[PDB]
Amino acid sequence: HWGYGKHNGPEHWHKDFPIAKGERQSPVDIDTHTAKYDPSLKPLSVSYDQATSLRILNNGHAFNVEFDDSQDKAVLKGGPLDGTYRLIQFHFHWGSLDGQGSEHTVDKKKYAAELHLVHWNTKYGDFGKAVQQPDGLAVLGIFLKVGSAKPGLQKVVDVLDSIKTKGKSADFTNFDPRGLLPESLDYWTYPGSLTTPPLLECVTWIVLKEPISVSSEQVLKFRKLNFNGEGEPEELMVDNWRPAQPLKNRQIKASFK
């Protein structure tokens, strides 16, 4: 099936998912000089006080921290969005080395990792319906650089032992995603896609300007995960990022001057 290798990685996905060569694919390089400030954009509203985390899963491609999305409990609104988007999961993309790992780039700079907080538009009733719509999802993307530790991340890092291999899950209740956010909510936004198969063109991307800092030790623990299942040959879960795609006929807008 699809993955990140030589024989099954991003450069192959188009055969099973021709939308890979579409008009609104993600990620992209953010050219900071050509992104235009849009005074009509709003402050982002990220309301995570009632978030209810449930479980953490190694899906063979990343790990997902899953939320209860059966009520408006952790919602994204404002910014470029019309209406209300409910948090379903977050995950990361990361590298084999600190010099790569992010999906978006900023003036071609690659960060060590990138956090995706995935939310679906409540007007479509559930996730699976939302991904069929051009305004179905809102993904908040946050860059990670290596430096100081992120205290709020440590709970995630320390459960990773228990979900080493593909298909393993663990209870992961009472985790507060507010501890993964930077100080500033300044952002760039553009219309794009999921960055993994099926590559659906359903996402309003909201990429924060300010990265969070994590320690080397934290990211090193990400890199101990496995793509493989239990008792299969070990293949470290690293470089689970799609490179930048053509911007085509899109504009990236900045929320800040």
User: Which positions touch Co ion (CB under 5 A)?
Assistant: 116
Both tokens of residue 153? Answer: 């991340």
Distance of CA 239 to the CA centre of its chain: 14
Neighbours of 169 (CB within 10 A): 16
Q: Which is nearer to Co ion, 79 or 101 (CB)?
A: 101
CB-based burial of residue 212 (10 Å sphere; 0-12 exposed, 13-18 middle, 19+ buried)? Answer: buried
Q: How far is the CB of 142 from Co ion (least distance, A)?
A: 11
Residue 175 CA to residue 9 CA, distance in Å, equals: 32
Please enumerate, by residue number, every residue annotated as part of a binding site for substrate.
195-196
Q: Is the peptide bond before 80 cis (omega within 30 degrees of 0)?
A: no
Q: How far is the CB of 197 from Co ion (least distance, A)?
A: 12
Both tokens of residue 81? Answer: 């969005």
Distance of CA 232 to the CA centre of its chain: 27
Q: How far is the CB of 33 from Co ion (least distance, A)?
A: 26
Write out 51-86 in H/E/C secondary structure: CCEEEEEECCCCEEEEECCCCCCCEEEECCCCCCEE
Does the annotation mark 7 as catalytic?
no
Q: Which is nearer to Co ion, 53 or 196 (CB)?
A: 196
Q: Which is nearer to Co ion, 168 or 242 (CB)?
A: 242
Residue 170, helix vs strand vs coil: strand
Instruction: Determine the residue with CB nearest Co ion.
Output: 116
From 33, 61, 104, 119, active-site residue? 61
Q: Which is nearer to Co ion, 38 or 145 (CB)?
A: 145
- CB of 30 closer than 8 Å to CB of 102: no
Residue 103 CA to residue 10 CA, distance in Å, equals: 12
Q: Which is nearer to Co ion, 38 or 127 (CB)?
A: 127
Q: How far is the CB of 194 from Co ion (least distance, A)?
A: 7
What secondary structure letter does DSSP report for 30? E
How many CA atoms, within 13 angstroms, populate the side-chain half-sphere of residue 149? 11
Catalytic residues: 61
